[PDB]
Write a protein that binds this ligand. Structure first.
Ligand code: SF4
Ligand SMILES: [Zn+2]
Lengths: 56, 322, 118, 677
DNA sequence: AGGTAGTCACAGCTGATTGCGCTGAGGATTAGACGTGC
DNA sequence: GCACGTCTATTATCCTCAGCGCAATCAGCTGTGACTACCT
């Protein structure tokens, strides 16, 4: 799910939330992982979406 | 029992508290209410009152009737009071038992022989016109902020600091005291400053050679823990309170010391000073009159020229409290 | 043995009895709604109770100390039984009566003070 | 003299009695008449013991049936010897003022190393082997084989005591440890054995905490001595810590290596009952499994035995038979010495503890080491969590247990830290002709910046500069020694390194000598000796140490030694190692103790303990300063002992460095004048 | 001409409020190798 | 073949958020002295 501040909602709901890594950027002379959304369980996906909408 | 630490006053041998709390006319604190209920249920032996002179008040008298005690012992240093309510104190507590003879007390050397002084300063022309022009109680600041009295006070402060003497400067009308103290950049007690700031200022006042002079605004008119001082300079005190002047004189004794009173000529301050020294002359003190200060022009003092003296008029008339 | 006030079944030890001396078994423990626990500050704000009313008025009100999930090192939240807090508030202020007007006049005085400061 | 208490007269060696001593005697008599426990607080290390002993003797004389045995457990051996000599002085005074002897016996108990006469075991420095050698030289088998008079070297003190020392008693004459040794060597008897035979017919006896808090020896030393007895723990402000450490064990690679080395020898001796021979062999691998497991922490006090009953599938019952096996199987094997054998015994003790005591404990494993965290070091420590476990056997077997020390300011936390029912809540503040101490709290420095030892500001340059300036201008006003305490060794070394980096430490050096306390015992001892010899003359010196160090309580700064005691910040224990947090959680969910409240209590207890050692004796005087604004808050001032609270005026609670120096100068100037008695 | 009710300038006190201090957990951004001139 | 200028790089460290108890702050009352006006 590509939702900003989704981890904070998961933290308030005590739901596991892991950042998804799609690539690495070499800006600034160093390699930094690129995060694109968050990977959350499908079982909690429906509950998480409503909670994130309410939080927004 | 003063609602500050609450050191379990219930079940005590000797209890120490203050007025204005035993005679509350409003709702009292729950802990305070229980403590008062406990305290009003047993007899007391030798109820000791401090600063008994201000006992005959509207609420302080009933404090005697709100508690039960066998002997009521009152202690004070300045029994003089206006409104002739001292006669009431004869039956409120008891008769005047002992009256110390201050002259023989200081003759034994255990009380500092304070050389009382009453030195006045002429009114500057830039101030006297406004003093005689205004009558609606706005003249209090005028003779208070006399440039000549300011110069005399600064000269005395510098002279006594050059000889390393502790100085306490009493001054009512805290509005004047503001510009009186910030001009010399010296510590002053506005009075509603804090509890800590006053305590630390008075604590570092004594054991510090760098700073040895402070300004007090009617706060030192009671029994405090002020350290030993040798010079007292009072300016613009209350109207005719002999008690206040006697207390201020009491803050110096403990010619070891000497205190000065500055007044403005051709003003009500002359009559006030004359009528408020009649207690100390009965005590045996004599107020020498000083009209000239040696070396007034020897060094530079504030308000040397007329420009700042006339500039002071705008800021002293800027009150306009209407 | 202790008789539960809800079911009447005798029991020896229960969570409410150990922590709040409440004669209620764990079976009837409605900790979600009836036996809800609230923070000390929230109870003081809602019911206008003081520390003396919570620690000095008989009977003394016990509380449960629990860790703060938001921050570890801060003072842990003190949780009081809502039923006991309500009972103490009723005993102090009488009832759900004029205390309600009292909070209204308190906020009115707050508005008066702020406008006076302005 | 003869003090007339409300229902008795008590003889006192000193004619003059301070009001604090009289009030303390009043309260102690009230407690004794109340037949219950209690806690006390006195500010003087000296003068408390004499009053306690005098009141105890008076109560025994008045009520012989109510009190029969007295225990005066202390912290170390110097306290034992000083209380013994004080009791000797009291008895001599009573004899000279009365004229007749009394059948009262007083003895001091210590380790077998302290009480031994064999010159073949004194020179060695092995405290774990002296007892084993003593058991090997004389035991039940030695007594059995002495009938045939075998020609072999063995201890013979017991072989004479059992035939000559078991008949003659010692009804009168209080004997010190040296007196016991002299009597044993002149009579050819073992001092320990005669002490064991003489405790039954005795009036008073003194020893250390380890003989009562440790259950493995308290039962042997105190089983049916007296059902109705009085015990007192003087200087027991850290009773909780020693109680916790009593049931605390540690395991490392050395222990398991020693066990696997010695089990082969044990099996070789055996092949020269079977319920334990095969039982002991496979116990090592279960605990060595955690050695090969790279995990941060495992906590399962109830489930540890469940996991043990899975890898090897062993019943929990035979574990309870391990301890009783030690006195049964081992003596049959005829162990030559306890060397290379203690880890095997402690493993059995740990197994018995985890089998029996698992309700209020926790198992912790840590793969961390100092400066070498992860090479090979899984340390398993069965740390205790409740101080009530070590205190139940003394509360249930005694009547008037009294806890007194120089720092017991919060009287509401001790009764709930350990299961206790106080009836006293009594505190006493010493008074003299003049204020002997001038405590003050220094807040912001001359730069109007707080000097708090905050964790986020440990590396801050401004606070270190302010600390250095305070120590410099303070070192020039208080002479001949200043004792400074820091939060930790790491912070202390980081501060002194920063001071050395700047041109500031040289200014302190040219005023006073700087001595740094380290972990080395010999280095610390020589540093203390040179500090003392430098303070003897006019050179003056500074002793920098840590609040939680062995030097904080190991020495007392008597007058002319350390006139000033400086506290650089509130000493907070490190929250790491996952041991403090477990105790905090246990107190939170069991005794309803706030974590911050307990941390503040421990910090202030340590600070007061390390700051109150500068006043020993009425004539002694000293200065006490706290270099942290956090001390200014009431929540920490209230944790200070009452005898220091009244002298901490509100005037000096947040004053800067210059005014603090001025106050110190005035106090020292006014305290040098002669005073009368 | 004297007594009394207000009024005003400072000061004190006590009775509530009422922002501020206790620590750990979050989301932001110089050196190695190759082309080239001497 | 050697040294100098220039282009480019495959996961780490540092400024800001979150409930209760202690101290700061204001409202209300009073004292203390003088000032002032109206009535007996
Ligand atoms: S029996 Fe006594 S004298 Fe002999 S070795 Fe043991 S402690 Fe020493
Ligand atoms: Zn039920």
């Amino acid at each position: 799910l590509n939702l900003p501040n989704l981890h904070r909602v998961a933290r308030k709901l005590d739901i596991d939330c892991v950042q998804a890594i799609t690539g690495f950027d070499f800006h600034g002379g160093y390699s930094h992982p690129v995060t694109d959304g968050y990977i959350v369980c499908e079982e909690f996906k429906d509950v998480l979406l409503t909670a994130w909408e309410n939080e927004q | 029992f003063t609602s500050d630490a609450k050191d379990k006053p219930i079940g005590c041998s000797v209890a120490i508290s203050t007025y204005s709390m035993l005679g509350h006319t409003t709702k009292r604190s729950w802990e305070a209410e229980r403590v008062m209920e406990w305290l009003k249920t047993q007899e007391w032996g030798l109820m000791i009152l401090d600063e008994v002179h201000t006992i005959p008040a509207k609420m302080f008298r009933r404090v005697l009737t709100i508690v039960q005690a066998h002997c009521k012992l009152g202690l004070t240093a300045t029994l003089v009071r206006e409104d002739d309510k001292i006669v009431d104190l004869n039956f409120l507590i008891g008769p005047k038992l002992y009256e110390a003879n201050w002259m023989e007390l200081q003759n034994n050397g255990y009380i500092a022989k304070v050389q009382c002084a009453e030195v006045w300063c002429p009114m500057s022309p830039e101030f006297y016109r406004e003093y005689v022009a205004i009558k609606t109680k706005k003249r209090i600041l005028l003779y208070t902020m006399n440039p000549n009295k300011f110069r005399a006070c600064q000269f005395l402060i510098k002279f006594h600091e050059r000889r390393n003497d502790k100085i306490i400067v009493f001054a009512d009308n805290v509005f004047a005291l503001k510009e009186y103290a910030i001009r010399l950049n010296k510590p002053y007690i506005y009075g509603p400053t804090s509890q800590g700031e006053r305590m630390q200022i008075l604590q570092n006042f004594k054991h510090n050679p760098k700073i040895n002079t402070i300004f007090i605004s009617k706060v030192g008119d009671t029994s405090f823990d002020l350290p030993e001082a040798n010079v007292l300079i009072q300016i613009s005190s209350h109207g005719g309170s002999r008690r206040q002047e006697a207390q201020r004189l009491g803050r110096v004794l403990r010619y070891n010391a000497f205190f000065y009173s500055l007044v403005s000529q051709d003003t009500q301050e002359m009559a006030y000073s004359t009528k408020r020294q009649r207690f100390l002359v009965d005590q045996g003190y004599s107020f020498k009159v000083i009209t000239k200060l040696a070396g007034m022009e020897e060094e530079d003092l504030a308000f040397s020229t007329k420009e700042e003296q006339q500039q002071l008029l705008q800021k002293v008339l800027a009150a306009t409290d209407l | 043995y202790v008789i539960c006030e809800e079911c009447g079944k005798e029991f020896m030890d229960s969570y409410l009895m150990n922590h709040f001396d409440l004669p209620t078994c764990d079976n009837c423990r409605d900790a979600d709604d009836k036996h809800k626990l609230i923070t000390k500050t929230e109870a003081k704000q809602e019911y206008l109770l003081k520390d003396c009313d919570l620690e000095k008025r008989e009977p003394p009100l016990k509380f449960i100390v629990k860790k703060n999930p938001h921050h570890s090192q801060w003072g842990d939240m003190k949780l009081y039984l809502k039923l006991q807090i309500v009972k103490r508030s009723l005993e102090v202020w009488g009832s759900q009566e004029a205390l309600e007007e009292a909070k209204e006049v308190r906020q009115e005085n707050r508005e008066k003070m702020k406008q006076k400061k302005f | 003299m003869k003090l007339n208490v409300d229902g008795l007269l008590v003889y006192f060696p000193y004619d003059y009695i301070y009001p604090e001593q009289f009030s303390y005697m009043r309260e102690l008599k009230r407690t004794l008449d109340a037949k219950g426990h209690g806690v006390l607080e006195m500010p003087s290390g000296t003068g408390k013991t004499v009053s306690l002993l005098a009141l105890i003797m008076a109560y025994q004389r008045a009520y012989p049936l109510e009190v029969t045995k007295l225990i005066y457990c202390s912290r170390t051996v110097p306290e034992i010897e000083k209380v013994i000599e004080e009791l000797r002085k009291l008895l001599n005074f009573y004899e000279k003022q009365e004229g007749e002897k009394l059948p009262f016996l007083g003895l001091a108990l210590s380790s077998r190393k302290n009480l031994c006469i064999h010159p073949e075991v004194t020179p060695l420095r092995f405290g774990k082997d002296v007892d084993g050698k003593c058991h090997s030289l004389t035991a039940s088998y030695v007594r059995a084989q002495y009938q045939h008079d075998t020609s072999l070297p063995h201890c013979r003190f017991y072989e004479e005591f059992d035939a000559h020392g078991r008949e003659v008693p010692l009804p009168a004459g209080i004997y010190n440890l040296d007196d016991l040794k002299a009597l044993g060597r002149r009579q050819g008897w073992c001092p320990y054995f005669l002490a064991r035979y003489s405790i039954l017919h005795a009036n008073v006896v003194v020893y250390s905490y380890h003989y009562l808090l440790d259950p493995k020896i308290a039962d042997l030393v105190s089983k049916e001595l007296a059902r109705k007895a009085v015990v007192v723990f003087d200087e027991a402000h850290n009773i909780d810590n020693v109680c916790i450490d009593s049931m605390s064990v540690n395991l490392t690679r050395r222990t398991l290596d020693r066990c696997q080395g010695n089990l082969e020898t044990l099996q070789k001796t055996v092949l020269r009952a079977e319920h334990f021979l095969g039982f002991l062999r496979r116990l090592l691998e279960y605990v060595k499994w955690r050695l090969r497991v790279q995990h941060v922490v495992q906590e399962s006090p109830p489930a540890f035995l469940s996991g043990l009953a899975q890898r090897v599938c062993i019943q929990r019952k035979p574990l309870r038979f391990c301890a009783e096996r030690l006195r049964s199987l081992l003596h049959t094997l005829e162990i030559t010495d306890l060397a290379d054998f203690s880890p095997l015994t402690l493993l059995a003790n740990f197994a018995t503890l985890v089998s029996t005591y698992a309700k209020g404990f926790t198992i912790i494993i840590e793969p961390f080491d100092d400066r070498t965290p992860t090479i090979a070091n899984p340390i398993l420590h069965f740390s205790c969590m409740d101080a009530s476990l070590a205190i139940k056997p003394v509360f249930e077997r005694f009547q008037s247990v009294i806890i007194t020390s120089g720092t017991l300011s919060p009287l509401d936390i001790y009764p709930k830290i350990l299961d206790f029912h106080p009836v006293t809540m009594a505190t006493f503040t010493m008074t003299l002709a003049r204020v002997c101490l001038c405590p003050m709290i220094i807040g912001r420095g001359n730069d109007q910046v707080a000097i708090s030892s905050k964790f986020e500001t440990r590396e801050d340059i401004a606070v270190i500069r302010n600390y250095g300036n305070l120590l410099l201008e303070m070192s020039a006003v208080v002479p001949d020694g200043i004792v400074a305490f820091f939060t930790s060794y790491q912070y202390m070394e980081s501060t002194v390194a920063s001071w050395y980096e700047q041109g500031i430490l040289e200014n302190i050096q040219r005023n006073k000598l700087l001595f740094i306390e380290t972990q080395d015992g010999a280095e610390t001892s020589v540093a203390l000796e040179k500090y003392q010899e430098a303070c003897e003359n006019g050179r003056g010196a500074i002793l920098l140490s840590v609040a939680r160090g062995k030097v904080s309580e190991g020495i007392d700064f008597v007058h002319h030694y350390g006139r000033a005691v400086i506290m650089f910040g509130v000493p907070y224990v490190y929250t790491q190692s996952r041991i403090l947090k477990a105790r905090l959680e246990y107190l939170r969910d069991q005794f309803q103790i706030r974590e911050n409240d307990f941390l503040t209590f421990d910090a202030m207890r340590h600070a007061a303990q390390c700051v109150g050692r500068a006043i020993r004796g009425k004539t002694d005087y000293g200065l006490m300063v706290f270099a942290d604004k956090r001390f200014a808050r009431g929540d920490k001032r209230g944790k200070l002992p009452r005898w220091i609270q009244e002298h901490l005026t509100d005037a000096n609670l947040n004053l800067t460095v210059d005014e603090g120096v001025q106050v110190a100068k005035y106090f020292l100037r006014q305290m040098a004048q002669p005073f009368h008695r």
